[PDB]
Amino acid sequence: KLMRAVRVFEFGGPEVLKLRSDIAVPIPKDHQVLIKVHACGVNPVETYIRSGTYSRKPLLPYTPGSDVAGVIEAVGDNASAFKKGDRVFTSSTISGGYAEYALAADHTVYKLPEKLDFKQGAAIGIPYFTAYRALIHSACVKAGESVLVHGASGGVGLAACQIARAYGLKILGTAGTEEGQKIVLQNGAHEVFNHREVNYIDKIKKYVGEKGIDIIIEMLANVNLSKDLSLLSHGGRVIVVGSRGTIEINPRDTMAKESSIIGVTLFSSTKEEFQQYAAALQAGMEIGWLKPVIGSQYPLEKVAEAHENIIHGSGATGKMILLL
Amino acid sequence: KLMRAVRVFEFGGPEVLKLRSDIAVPIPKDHQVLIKVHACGVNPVETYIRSGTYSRKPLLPYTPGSDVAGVIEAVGDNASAFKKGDRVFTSSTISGGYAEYALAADHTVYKLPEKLDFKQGAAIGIPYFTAYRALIHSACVKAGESVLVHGASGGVGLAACQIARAYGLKILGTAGTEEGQKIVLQNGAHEVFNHREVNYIDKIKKYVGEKGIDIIIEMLANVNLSKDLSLLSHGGRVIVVGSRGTIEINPRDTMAKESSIIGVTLFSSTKEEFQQYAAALQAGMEIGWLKPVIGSQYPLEKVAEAHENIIHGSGATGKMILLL
Ligand SMILES: NC(=O)c1ccc[n+]([C@@H]2O[C@H](COP(=O)([O-])OP(=O)(O)OC[C@H]3O[C@@H](n4cnc5c(N)ncnc54)[C@H](OP(=O)(O)O)[C@@H]3O)[C@@H](O)[C@H]2O)c1
Ligand SMILES: NC(=O)c1ccc[n+]([C@@H]2O[C@H](COP(=O)([O-])OP(=O)(O)OC[C@H]3O[C@@H](n4cnc5c(N)ncnc54)[C@H](OP(=O)(O)O)[C@@H]3O)[C@@H](O)[C@H]2O)c1
Ligand SMILES: [Cl-]
Ligand SMILES: [Cl-]
Ligand SMILES: [Cl-]
Ligand SMILES: [Cl-]
């Protein structure tokens, strides 16, 4: 049995993402399951991996993608939590999610509540688990604190707005377009700003006044970190979620406020931590505040475009997904 | 009724530090005490204040200095914890410590154990309180963790080495001279490096290997913060104690390690925190690990030289003090 899958044979630009229709369908064993993929999330980390310059360099060739949603097609003998026909989503796969079928370890697969479709299931894995770790673990947020989600219109950003809202925070978000701004306001933000405007930081400061902001969830630290330090309240923290370069800062900016700059990586989470996050996000999905938003959809054939556009495109309006 | 005191009539360089011998001796009231000063510590912050460019900007003229040691000369009505003849040291003064007699608020005055001399009492106030906050409060130190004291040969540096030693930490330190390196080794560092050497960071790297360093106490974050991030263990933290400029950093350096950059300022401490720290340090003095180290001594008349040399001199070998 054969399938369509994206294969990378060598590292490089989006052009290295090959569509092949002659890829063997994996056969799950032991604790593995096989998922018939309906959609797969596109995460910016997949672009870094593909470029060959990220800290993870998979063995070539490989199929990209960690975040699928679909239906269990087959199970290994010990993958007792799942059966054929189960609607599921993932935070990892073994064989790669950019494919008609994906092999995954049973502990990186979760049931998909009936009220979320497969497109939404594909938005969950990295974005919502990352946002939850950043807020609950890294920032140790408390109800009533203020948060700025700096890059709120994409996958992690909207997830952060929804979690922050559920956990009782005062929420500011930024977006680069009018439509992105609108979506951010529909998903938890009390107030939104345009990060392409010359004076938007002034507008944020006018808005928060002298007390400043308790938490900043930063998607683009190489552009924003110094400005972030000026916005922090006394004892405030900026969580470095995303970063794509270097930045000049004044370390004195942390001193009088005793503020913190704190890095996060979802990959660093323990198994116990993932189980905690999964339980939190399942509760969100069933109560109904966890409602993933899909901003763009690409057929598998247009994977090079998807990669290009997630890094260089016009502006996010939610999660970008591949449709199978 | 007359005393000798340093007086600053206008902000500027070391040349603004004048000597006067006709200053009226202050009269303590309410919770104030008067201290007959034997020695006063020189803290770098006094040079920033003197320049007129620090956030604290005193009314002119003033006498500099927060950290004195001597004997209680007189007490206000309500300063019940003190009596004439008590040996004491300070972490603040009201009238200025660069003087034969200094007025101080009773809550910023602490008993000096008989076995420490007044020269050593002058080294305690800002240095040891700051280092204890940095290690205990900011870093949340646990025994057996590793620490680099980056700038270990000065007042806060040696304080940090001794506190770290009392916690059984694995201790690395840096100094800029042969004599500086030896004093750091003498006060608890397992290994020392020369921060004037080209590629001394590589020597530290080779020495700590892949596991890295749990805690960095950073005296000069504008020079070292980026190199610090490369040295940190997973969950590692660099505490910004001193900083005199800007620095380019890569925020991705915090992400894979989930490391933190944390500002500290001693004068952010609550009353309750100061009491906690005082209790810790009193125990340190009693049990014998808190043994202040005097690197250089200046008569009051050479205060201008002392300010010049603390910023621009040949290298620290402990606390710099003024002798009355
Ligand atoms: N630490 C981790 O474990 C972890 C996990 C997941 C993701 N990440 C990283 O976090 C970042 C966000 O991931 P994602 O999935 O949300 O990506 P995404 O869906 O592509 O969203 C990118 C976000 O960046 C925003 N942005 C553009 N210019 C900005 C600026 N000047 N200031 C602030 N934000 C700006 C975009 O806003 P507009 O489109 O509206 O302009 C959009 O909201 C990526 O760099 C990713 O690699 C890290
Ligand atoms: N955050 C706060 O509340 C607080 C409190 C007290 C002090 N401080 C600040 O902390 C800093 C240290 O205070 P201190 O009283 O210990 O000053 P100090 O007694 O003058 O000591 C200065 C130290 O900095 C070192 N140094 C010189 N070049 C260095 C380099 N390239 N990298 C790392 N260290 C280097 C010196 O080493 P060598 O002489 O051997 O070259 C010496 O150990 C000052 O900037 C001060 O303003 C902050
Ligand atoms: Cl990938
Ligand atoms: Cl986002
Ligand atoms: Cl005082
Ligand atoms: Cl020092």
Side-chain angles (χ1 to χ4, degrees), chain A residues 201-221:
Chain A
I201 295 291
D202 290 337
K203 301 182 186 175
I204 298 184
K205 290 183 180 168
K206 186 197 185 301
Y207 184 74
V208 299
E210 273 313 306
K211 55 99 212 178
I213 307 170
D214 301 317
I215 306 113
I216 299 180
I217 304 296
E218 183 53 59
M219 308 308 172
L220 197 65

Side-chain angles (χ1 to χ4, degrees), chain A residues 9 30 43 45 60 74 80 83 102 125 199 204 213 223 231 313:
Chain A
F9 296 98
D30 199 3
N43 296 286
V45 70
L60 297 158
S80 61
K83 79 223 320 141
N199 39 207
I204 298 184
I213 307 170
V223 172
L231 289 173

